Write a protein that binds this DNA or RNA. Structure first.
Lengths: 45, 359
RNA sequence: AGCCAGGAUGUUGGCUUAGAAGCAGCCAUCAUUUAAAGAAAGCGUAAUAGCUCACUGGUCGAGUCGGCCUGCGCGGAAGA
RNA sequence: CCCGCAGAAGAAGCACCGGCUAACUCCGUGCCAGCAGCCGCGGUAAUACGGAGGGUGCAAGCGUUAAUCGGAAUUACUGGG
RNA sequence: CGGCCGCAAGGUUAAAACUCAAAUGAAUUGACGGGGGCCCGCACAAGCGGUGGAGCAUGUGGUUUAAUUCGAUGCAACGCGAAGAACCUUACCUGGUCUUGACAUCCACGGAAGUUUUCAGAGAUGAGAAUGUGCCUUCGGGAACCGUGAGACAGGUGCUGC
RNA sequence: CCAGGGCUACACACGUGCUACAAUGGCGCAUACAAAGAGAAGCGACCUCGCGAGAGCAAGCGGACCUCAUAAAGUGCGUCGUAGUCCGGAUUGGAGUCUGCAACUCGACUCCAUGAAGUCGGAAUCGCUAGUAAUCGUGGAUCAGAAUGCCACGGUGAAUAC
RNA sequence: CCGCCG
RNA sequence: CGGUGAUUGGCGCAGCCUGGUAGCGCACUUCGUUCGGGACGAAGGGGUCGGAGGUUCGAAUCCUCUAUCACCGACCA
């Protein structure tokens, strides 16, 4: 199925417009433990 | 001894068979000649020459492989039965049947990955980092080292043209020209988004990132050989100019209208006193207006063709590069490698050659 | 010049083994059967067919065929 | 409505199972496919996805959606600042 | 926005769509401050001799490579893992070989273990030709070692120090 | 599993070192004073040969005794006369020694010849307050061989801290 | 005195 | 259309009239400084002067031709 992208009416490049689109934003994950790992309640209980 | 080519010619003979549906090409061929069993195909020659064009393609594809089917067995069978004799004339006749098969194989190698619209011409990579900060830019330059250590290893020449370096590390963009023979044929399966998962030395937390980078391969071509049209296709009238100052504006036919009937755009000029200068200005003015109708002919194709690439879905995430878990997985062809430090810094022919056989 | 005849063969000539058997083109442009018949000048075919012409006999019965140097002419030649 | 006839014979589903909120493990998949009322799950050892076994709830019904009041002392006269 | 007021600036009255799952108040423990006070270490100051320039030695990045194995990479990686790479080491590369295997256990068969040399090959290996045939007797056998076949399996300096 | 190759590649960039750029120095002769370690397929006297690295021979010692092993800076005497020079010891040609199956890739050392950059080093930057810095040599581990590295030992011996 | 960013 | 005056490093401009030797800032490269980037500092490197031909022993300069850009004039019926 289709994808409703950000950049309305992409002209030239058909692949370097989507690279800035939030489909290809940088997925950064969370640490544990690690500079930024506070729980407050974890996955269970 | 010579069993290493005998074992090598077998493995690359059936991958051509599997990635063409070797049994099912004769299936279509037996449907082709079934319509040729009817005598009355000759009443429609627009349909008739279409069928015989498809026939010789379906014939010559399977006939290269059906003679290969006996060819793998007997050339081995010439030597594996006369290793009992160990005869030296047998080695002379075995290699004569061999390189013929190796020619039939390699011309069927270069048959499908040939292929179409100046596919053999020289190339341009245009790699970008996109989004993510430094880590996306450090991965845009690892792709730069990866292809420059690949495309130099197969006999091409690298020419860095435009380049945008990072503020701290890596590059923002690079645009190389990679020239050789069949350059674009090896690089047309690279236009996509290369996904990198690792842990940044540039992140302060040492967290795990998932960066993306484009690598847009496009082939070169000549842009414009564009001149004046045939003057029969343009209509030139003259008339009295509209203005004031004297009746000099209203006595002489000093204006000009050049009308281009294959398009229908009307270039006019009233700028000068003399018709010969107005006609000379309006002729050059219309060749500029024939540039723009040919730019807008190109630019509308550039928008319409890549409203399709935009709407493919998932924007071609081709080849996950997951370095922290030490694997790598191509996406449209599914070939997987466990060597990450070999695919980085060269050795991309597991991924390219397996994706030139698939469509 | 007419009119009556033949206008042969391996020659599916390789060729790109998709075609060109003379017929879009590279060569070669042979030898054979021949009184002759281009390993083809038009037609005709995707390519082979099919229809003619070069060339060859019969017929007929006296002049004929293409160039050169020139004299006078014709077309080209439509305005209020 | 009553008597007689035969034959266990014709008759059990739907939701849920991380916390709230009763009820858990294995397998598949790997920020994908998906879930979701809120907080949020999924980045390779997911009680949260999907399936399986087990269990809990209601039961000829069981859930979702919508609407209303309740919880809400969250327009408070009762009953706030 | 509309009204009223104003010469104007604008005041006053005063929404909704939409969006977020919080925004906020006081106080606690830290950390930080180009806030304060006190105090110490070659920290500065006072000195001495270096490094940076030169040549080489060694390690690293890059580049090259068939391979230039892998790990270490602010301080706290870079004469580090290596208290020592000609072969070996050695994990890498090119080619030549092998599959219950170089090393381990179990089963069935052979053979005492070993010692002497030839030939082919770069060697691994591929055959030989020679020699020896013992310690305990169920005397279909031991134990030690070697060869072979069959499957459990061995093997991995392969991956993840997240 | 094996043979050859690579880890020693080299337009380059950085780190840590050693050697220097000299006269408080170089060379030549003579001469004084150490500590700590190691040694058995090991350390290897005396003697003889070789200019030398080394070889031959053959004692001693698993050692407070035998060997490695003459300590070097120092001091005496002579010359050099401030020049890229009698400084520097890079690179290289030739001839060798030893280890090892093997020294081409790629070992150390000796002899003869060669005689490079370097005349105290930009911005910058490091170590040290006492037997320390600095300088001078010695021994060990790893190891057949192969250190300027590491780890230890003693010689001389400061300057400065308001 | 100058002293911006993550 | 003529006439005027330019083209010099990646860019923006000096030197060109007066013939023999090309700079300035910024950007680039290496180093330093910082945990890192910018800023700062220290070293550097880069052009044969729009193309083509003349004059001279010699042309970025002096003439002539184009090529491009900019400014000005293109009036009277």
């Amino acid at each position: 199925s289709r994808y409703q992208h950000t950049k309305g009416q992409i002209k030239d490049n058909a692949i370097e417009a989507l690279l800035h689109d939030p489909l290809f934003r940088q997925r950064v994950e969370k640490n544990k433990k690690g500079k930024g790992s506070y729980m407050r309640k974890g996955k269970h209980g | 001894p010579v069993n290493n080519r005998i074992q090598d010619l077998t493995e690359r003979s059936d991958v051509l068979r599997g990635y063409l549906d070797y049994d099912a090409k004769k299936e279509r061929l037996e449907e082709v000649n079934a319509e040729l069993e009817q005598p009355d195909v000759w009443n429609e020659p627009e349909r008739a020459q279409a069928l015989g064009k498809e026939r010789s393609s379906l014939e010559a594809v399977v006939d290269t492989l059906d003679q290969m089917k006996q060819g793998l067995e007997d050339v081995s069978g010439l030597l594996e039965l006369a290793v009992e004799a160990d005869d030296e004339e047998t080695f002379n006749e075995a290699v004569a049947e061999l390189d013929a098969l190796e020619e039939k194989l390699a011309q069927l190698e270069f048959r499908r990955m040939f292929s179409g619209e100046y596919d053999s011409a020289d190339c341009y990579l245009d790699i970008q980092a996109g989004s993510g900060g430094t880590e996306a830019q450090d991965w845009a330059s690892m792709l730069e080292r990866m292809y420059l250590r690949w495309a130099e290893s197969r006999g091409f020449k690298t020419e860095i043209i435009e380049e945008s370096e990072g503020e701290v590390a890596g590059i923002k963009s690079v645009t190389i020209k990679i020239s050789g023979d069949y350059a674009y044929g090896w690089l047309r399966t690279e236009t996509g988004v290369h996904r990198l998962v690792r842990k940044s030395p540039f992140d302060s937390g040492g967290r795990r990132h998932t960066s993306f980078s484009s690598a847009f391969v496009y082939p070169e071509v000549d842009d414009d050989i564009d001149i004046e049209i045939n003057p029969a296709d343009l209509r030139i009238d003259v008339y009295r100019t509209s203005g004031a100052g004297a009746q000099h504006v209203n006595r002489t036919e000093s204006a000009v209208r050049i009308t281009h009937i294959p398009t229908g755009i009307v270039t006019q000029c009233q700028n000068d006193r003399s018709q010969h200068k107005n006609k000379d200005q309006a002729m050059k003015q219309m060749k500029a207006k024939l540039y723009e109708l040919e730019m807008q002919k190109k630019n509308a194709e550039k928008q319409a063709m890549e409203d399709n690439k935009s709407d493919i879905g998932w924007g071609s995430q081709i080849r996950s590069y997951v370095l922290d878990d030490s694997r790598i997985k191509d996406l449209r062809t599914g070939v997987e490698t466990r060597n990450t430090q070999a695919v980085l810094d060269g050795s991309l022919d597991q991924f390219i050659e397996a994706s030139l056989k698939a469509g």
